[PDB]
Amino acid sequence: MDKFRVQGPTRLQGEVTISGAKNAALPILFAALLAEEPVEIQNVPKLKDIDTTMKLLTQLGTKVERXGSVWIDASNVNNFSAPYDLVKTMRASIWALGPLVARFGQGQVSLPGGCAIGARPVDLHIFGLEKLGAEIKLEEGYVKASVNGRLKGAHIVMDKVSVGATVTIMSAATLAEGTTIIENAAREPEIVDTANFLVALGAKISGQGTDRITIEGVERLGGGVYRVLPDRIETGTFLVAAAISGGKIVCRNAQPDTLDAVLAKLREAGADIETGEDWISLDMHGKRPKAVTVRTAPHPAFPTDMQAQFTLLNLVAEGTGVITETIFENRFMHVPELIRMGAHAEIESNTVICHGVEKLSGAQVMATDLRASASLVLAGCIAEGTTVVDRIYHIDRGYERIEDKLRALGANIERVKGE
Numbered sequence: 001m002d003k004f005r006v007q008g009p010t011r012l013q014g015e016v017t018i019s020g021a022k023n024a025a026l027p028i029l030f031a032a033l034l035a036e037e038p039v040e041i042q043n044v045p046k047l048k049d050i051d052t053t054m055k056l057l058t059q060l061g062t063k064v065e066r067x068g069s070v071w072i073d074a075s076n077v078n079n080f081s082a083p084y085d086l087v088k089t090m091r092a093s094i095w096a097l098g099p100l101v102a103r104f105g106q107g108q109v110s111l112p113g114g115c116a117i118g119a120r121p122v123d124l125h126i127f128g129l130e131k132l133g134a135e136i137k138l139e140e141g142y143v144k145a146s147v148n149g150r151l152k153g154a155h156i157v158m159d160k161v162s163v164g165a166t167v168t169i170m171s172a173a174t175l176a177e178g179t180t181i182i183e184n185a186a187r188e189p190e191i192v193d194t195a196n197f198l199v200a201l202g203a204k205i206s207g208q209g210t211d212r213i214t215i216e217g218v219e220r221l222g223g224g225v226y227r228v229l230p231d232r233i234e235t236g237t238f239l240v241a242a243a244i245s246g247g248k249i250v251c252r253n254a255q256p257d258t259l260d261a262v263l264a265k266l267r268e269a270g271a272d273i274e275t276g277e278d279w280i281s282l283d284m285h286g287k288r289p290k291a292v293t294v295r296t297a298p299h300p301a302f303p304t305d306m307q308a309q310f311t312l313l314n315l316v317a318e319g320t321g322v323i324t325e326t327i328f329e330n331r332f333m334h335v336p337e338l339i340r341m342g343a344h345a346e347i348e349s350n351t352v353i354c355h356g357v358e359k360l361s362g363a364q365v366m367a368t369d370l371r372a373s374a375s376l377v378l379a380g381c382i383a384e385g386t387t388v389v390d391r392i393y394h395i396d397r398g399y400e401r402i403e404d405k406l407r408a409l410g411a412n413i414e415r416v417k418g419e
């Protein structure tokens with residue numbers, strides 16, 4: 001069980017090159033099942049879920065190869081069932097369903113949590129596919145979809161904003177007959193990237209990034225080359241790393257417009273920020289951050305995946321600031337660990353009241369959530385002494401070699417094997 005041993009305090013300064021977003025690469029890799037011609041997906045990070053996805057695609061008959069790119073040939077997909085052993089570690093496997101039924105008229109995906117009645121994430125995917133004309137059967141541990149001929153466009157009102165179901169419905173709609181209009185569509189940049197990838201293959205999609213997406217179906221999709229957009233949360237994490245350590249950083253291979261709310265909140269904390277077409281610079285001019293108010297909400301508002309990192313920023317800031325979590329009004333496990341490093345905070349309801357302190361102290365800490373865990377590593381970089389962050393494989397599933405990128409910024413950090 002790997003751990004990171006960090007020695008602080010260190011001012012983090014320099015540059016970092018942002019990896020492609022795993023959360024955009026995943027939906028794009030599943031959407032590639034729709035492609036009749038070869039596809040090259042560029043800037044794909046090397047992370048576990050990408051490997052899991054490639055193995056699942058291969059089981060369906062797809063030919064897949066990878067390096068920085070992932071090359072796909074789905075011309076001969078010939079098995080339309082995603083089995084239990086290949087889906088059990090990744091809920092995103094459900095994204096194979098829509099493309100399979102849309103292209104081949106049938107598909108099925110194993111459900112590890114069962115088919116028992118009650119409300120589940122898969123419900124909105126089923127809802128949308130049934131609106132497009134698919135018959136959905138929940139039998140023998142699978143969700144199975146089928147349709148005679150092509151799906152048919154429909155006006156679909158999602159009663160909850162859902163990235164997963166938005167992707168399923170938008171992707172399947174690309175091959176339906178007619179027009180599909182998705183209301184209350186998720187607006188995430190990863191949805192916009194998936195939409196633009198589909199358009200690159202020949203789909204017709206507009207409104208992506210807004211609450212309403214319109215897809216005009218076509219008979220078949222082709223192939224091409226598409227580059228996955230930068231990971232905005234990895235970017236935010238490194239910006240916060242500089243913001244809490246009196247540092248200065250330039251993030252390369254970045255996309256500023258995916259972080260409007262984050263950059264505005266960092267400017268409130270006193271950061272001097274500039275942006276270019278593909279870079280963001282942040283400079284604290286050696287100053288401690290000023291406390292800020294944070295309220296998470298659906299994109300384009302402040303992202304819940306940056307909440308832990310901004311909780312840490314407030315805990316070393318000047319002033320009392322409040323973090324309100326509306327998405328997972330209970331994602332606060334980083335708080336008790338930061339208190340053990342000297343932070344002052346009280347969790348009340350779905351909020352954390354932060355009273356900033358000048359300096360944290362090293363401690364042995366651990367969190368399962370990868371953003372809370374990454375926040376603990378950043379805390380170790382600025383705390384006095386030695387910090388040991390345990391179970392960092394969680395971080396490894398979402399960040400490529402974070403210790404190397406942090407070391408390039410001046411951190412004293414070492415990956416220790418089995419302690």
Ligand SMILES: O=S(=O)(O)c1cccc2cccc(Nc3ccccc3)c12
Pocket residue numbers: 087088089090091092093094110111112113114120121122
């Ligand atoms: O949400 S499911 O559609 O079943 C589901 C679908 C596809 C892949 C899954 C992988 C792990 C866990 C699930 N759910 C789960 C939930 C409760 C207990 C055990 C497993 C997965």
